[PDB]
Symmetry: D2
Subunit: 279 residues, 4 copies
């Protein structure tokens, strides 16, 4: 009979090249370990949900203001009503009798470039503007020259003495608690200009979270500024939006399931079929 592989490996006479290299959890052994931090060390060292996003995503002890700011970003992103595209898809999937996972999932797949992509795009735009020299008056004019809108700037109603008021809370926190905010100050000059163009072009919350998150990564400790670009270039700022808005999508699922609403069918006079006359 051949030797058993678990018994052969035990005495260690064999290699096997293990795939699936991972570095954010150690579910074996005595107790659960997140980064190098056991779960009891997570709980008795005071660190919040933002603390375990620091441990699981960025693999670092973030300081307490950064953990509370990550918590703030997940709070403000949580829901923006059911009219928007992803929550619409969750309501349709929940209303057709599906699960929590399928309804959440069918809503989450909408989150892309047009919906929910203003976080990562508004971070990348302003970061590439700020670390390549450009003064804000040249940056606004340059995005006017090639005809692209500035992502993270523009709100449909809220202009002047009428702030977004979840931008106001995040801006107050970032002024009060962060040590240094360079890219925020550039995002507020290049917005102190764009409001003078037309008054309702304030910073979005989708732009404020992006610039303050890039500012948080490259301004606090434990990020080397060339890793702090790695997480933004990967798409860690999409993760903030998706984890934040999963809260509201599951809320929409539970709400549509609790109201006992039947299957949706879109009305025929909101379609305008333009089929070819004979193909």
């Amino acid at each position: 009979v051949p030797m058993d592989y678990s018994w052969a490996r035990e005495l260690g006479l064999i290699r096997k090249p293990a795939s699936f290299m991972t570095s954010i959890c150690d579910e074996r052994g005595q107790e659960l370990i997140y980064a190098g931090m056991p779960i009891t060390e997570v709980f008795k060292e005071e660190m919040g949900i933002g603390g375990v996003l620091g441990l699981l995503w960025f693999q670092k002890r973030l300081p307490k203001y950064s953990c509370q700011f990550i918590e703030m970003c997940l709070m403000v992103t949580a829901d923006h009503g059911p009219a928007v595209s992803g929550a619409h898809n969750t309501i349709i999937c929940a209303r057709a009798g599906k699960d929590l996972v399928s309804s959440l999932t069918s809503g989450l797949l909408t989150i892309g470039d047009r919906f929910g992509g203003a976080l990562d795009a508004a971070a990348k735009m302003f970061s590439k503007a700020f670390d390549s020299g450009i003064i804000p008056m040249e940056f606004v004019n340059k995005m006017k020259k090639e005809g692209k809108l500035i992502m993270g700037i523009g709100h449909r109603v809220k202009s002047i003495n009428n702030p977004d008021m979840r931008v106001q809370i995040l801006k107050d926190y970032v002024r009060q608690h962060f040590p240094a905010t360079p890219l925020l100050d550039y995002a507020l000059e290049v917005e102190k200009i764009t409001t003078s163009k037309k008054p309702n072009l304030i910073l979005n919350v989708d732009g404020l979270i992006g610039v303050a998150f890039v500012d948080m990564l490259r301004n606090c400790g434990s990020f080397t500024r060339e890793e702090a670009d790695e997480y933004i270039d990967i798409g860690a700022l999409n993760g903030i939006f998706v984890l934040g808005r999963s809260m509201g999508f599951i809320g929409h699922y539970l709400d549509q399931k609790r109201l006992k609403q039947g299957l949706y069918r879109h009305p025929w006079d909101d379609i305008s079929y333009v089929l070819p006359e004979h193909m």
Copy 2:
């Protein structure tokens, strides 16, 4: 140094209990093998797309009428307009700038019990009615007694001298080509009672495909009638709907992407928010 595993196995001194038991493809070796049938044997033995659904799902040579009928079922299921729930989700996800896979996927997750579930439910209902004795007049009355609608019966407009006309094509094919159709004849004695109740309660295509598919499995060769209940009990009839309607969902994605339509946002006066006054 330890011995290399692939080299320890090659000359065969070791076991390893292989998981992932599979039986529908052999991608290794000389050429691709679907069931026991190489791909050249698939192509030069005349067998259609329904032939390779027979090979990949049910793992059998289905006869040519059954392969053509599977092709017919995939043809009629292909699209039913954009107003329906799943194609709505595909249009929303495609219109928010996502991929083909994410738009198709966000539409496919709607396919459940209320949308797209009439195939498997209408098959299971009529099969459990027919193999448990019950005469059609007692079956209609019995589903009246416990207050459940008969799945696969009922169409919103099409009643009498106004057939579904894709039910008509499938019914003509099943009469002309199938050897024996017991459960179809029971499903038509039940539609010929229920149309006499109210005339627009004809067989759906969602009920005709289910009863003719159960009839195809347990009536043609190579199915033993505990295998032929196994595939219906698993949900192979959901697979017919999902593979059929993936065609129309990808068509809706390509159509919405070709028309260059911007991000959707549902209008606020089609919502009627009923939030609590103070929580």
Copy 3:
């Protein structure tokens, strides 16, 4: 808008930015007492004051200070101090104006003889810039067009110093000729490098040492700040020398820049019984002229204005300022408030009326006391419903309110109120039946208005052929043509829009003020465009003159800037002119008539449409040349277009003060070019003590109306009988037999829009999509009933907004903290587990965050991640049916089911799970009552006696502690608490917790840069059939 600046600021900008070979002495040698600073900081920071002799002037926009003597010349400090005492901070007057004599400039006195003061003045005219010089300086410069040398220089032209020496410096002293030849060229390059409208150096002391500037008057184009805000910096436009503002006027002055809107108030007399509340900027002039014309000139109170359709609260605030101010002192003849106005183009009249009537009902007490009488006239979209509801509040609170519609004359109400009348290669055709237009900008409302006008006037094709919007790719916008839907191609560049529609000859440039210039020039590079209509307001006058020069070079007709557009009924309508189709159908603008008007303000074209509609046949063509001081086409360019046109039979001209323009009309009748009857009336006859600018005695409405009266143009005395005289001359031309009235055909009718009807409430449409967890509309996000600032102010965690968004309740502090902990322990459990495996596979095939997280979350079902809901349901069903734990374990044993939520693999007893232990500790110290946890712990105390590794999992203790939380704390009623378990709120806890770990696994696999995974063939064991 040419706004004057103080001579300190003009001196400062001159000393900063001048570029000449001359040495400008006394550079930054100026101080400014600002009769209210101290007398020591100014004498130390500018320590040159003790070094020379001095001079003091007032820099408060005072004109001709050398005649009446507000100047203090050639003294020392204390003589000047004494002067400043009987000056620095009390009343003084010049001409007519009286006021506090505030700001004084102080200059070091230059020793000058009378042979060295010179005179230079550069002012902007329409055809260029005029530089003007006189070498016999001082105040006695004499006449300015005869002896003082003028020199026009064109626009986008360079003034050569050879030109200054040869044309302008002829009678200069020969010793001081080349220093001035440098100075004038440097001063002109300063002049047009900044955007000055008017610069005045009088006098100009040029000695052997160099050049000394002493007094300047500068008016700068204040709308050009977007070019020169870095160059002016902190520019200050002082108000002209007058009285002090009231404590209501400053309230409206900072109510001005509160929303984008025009809110103006200037009081003529605060004891005046006649008060105006008039919408529309031209109507505030016309109403004031009609009141002043009818004996109310000393009893008119102000010249109020509201425009831009401000908010209900904002119009409430302006209305409370205007109604409060007339209750200060009464008058035995009674007091009148006049809610005037022209037709509003698109604004719902009813809502602004709701604001005004809420203000009236808010101040109803003193209004009944003081005997105010309100005369109201308004028109527009839904003007009727507003008029009825304001008659309703006039019946409610007892104040006499007389409401009037579009049928009555707009200024008939002020004669009814006083009681004088009783109370009851440029082309001669621009638009045709077949002209297409290209709209520059995403202006779907204006384009839809144009298509609606084209459908109602029985026109065969839409006149919007394409749209150009440079901020998005080419697509098709979906518009309405009648009741069916058509597609209008939206382009990105201009060139492809011109190539794909080569027969377009009209462009409507809806660009903003700072990008209208280059967009219009880029348009003018294409020669198929014959007319451009510039809608933007606030384009600087230098760019407007450059556009005018290239239009006269290329033969293109510019209508604008600051216009609403023009309308040719039956043919074409430029954007927003006329209003929506209520005003088009009401003024009968779907068919052509025989009367053509030219108006200057865009807001008065609607009232001219009314007067022509109700008195005569109808409008044939009406263009608004715009509000700018340099219109692209003047009056004289359009009356010649109409006189050449055979379709018209009479021409109406509505002029204002400013620009010698109606004297060209006088010359046109004088030499007989204009033979068709012209009725004209220049509004702005408020002389009883851009637009309006550089006015002489001949530039006033009285002198202009006198000149056109004597020249043969029919002129009415006031605006009231403009309708009467236009009907009189219409009867003249139908009695003579040249005007024939064609028969009225009914027009094609359009459906009313859904938004309009829905907003004006006549249609109810059943709304699907009931929701209760977010209110995105309104001012603030509302989660359950909480605004988002109430969420952050109360410091309620992520568990708090899970309570708000999922359960719609305020959970207590321990429950929010517990939900945070049970998300935290659920966060990730390694990559070997099934869902994290799927996320690693999908992330490792190069997918996004959403696709990888999604492909992992879809594993979360009944076997993986289903222990939460199933363990909570099983223990809830065991506890609620009153089964003791010893019987519950056996009843699971007899049914052949494992107790879900109990059983761990390695860690058992005195080796616990250690995150079960944390949650169990928290639930013991913080929960008020724990029945279900106690039941689950006794079931654990049995099944660990069975086998020691059968403890409560975290997947079972989160379930029983969550059901324990739901049915054991407050705010849940045990039929809501059981419902949320059956819906699957415990699946949501697991999915939201594990999403953190799955996104972490995605980021970890993406950051390690690991490539595509193919599962090894040695781990498969294919069991294919033999030969199917």
Copy 4:
């Protein structure tokens, strides 16, 4: 009372700007209409599943050879064994007790750029090479110069007198039935050039389907080249792969559900955790 919107709209005094412009199905009316073609006209005019992909995706009557070729492409793409990434995800999701839709969906989301992206990439690469002049010897050298592999070329075992043998069937069909095959001949010349370098760099089926599909679109009738570049630029060739491989993924779901296989958990000695020692 206000007027009812359906009654208001009916007699037509009102507009409402209908969103959701669509052009591939007309589920209202007498009978189902795919492009301009009713469903009876689909069935009695002989046209296959490839015919209704022609109607639903490209909105045209494709000729019978093109419909049969689309059917061929869906046949060969159907499965390539369970070891590959997407079928692996379907087996994991099916083995954890999920639905057909969730298992299919969790497998389909793998289909991206590294798995299943060789179709669209191999089409775009060769099309941009062929319509920009470049001779094949310069094209191979140019993709050597900038260090990119040629997508759709390279097979792990099958080299010379050992063809892919589903490439052979498609190549035989394209030679026999297509009218003109320019881009295939350029892909064939290039294939030959690459093979002479190292013999196992033949055309993949993932490259042959891409070049023959671009050839089919721009070579048969009813496609103007600009609008035939539209469908390739959108990603219609991803749709062929996804609709083809959905067959095998549903087969893998039904197979894993029929074998009654329990929950999968990856072995711990195939992971190699590299967690930080203390974070």
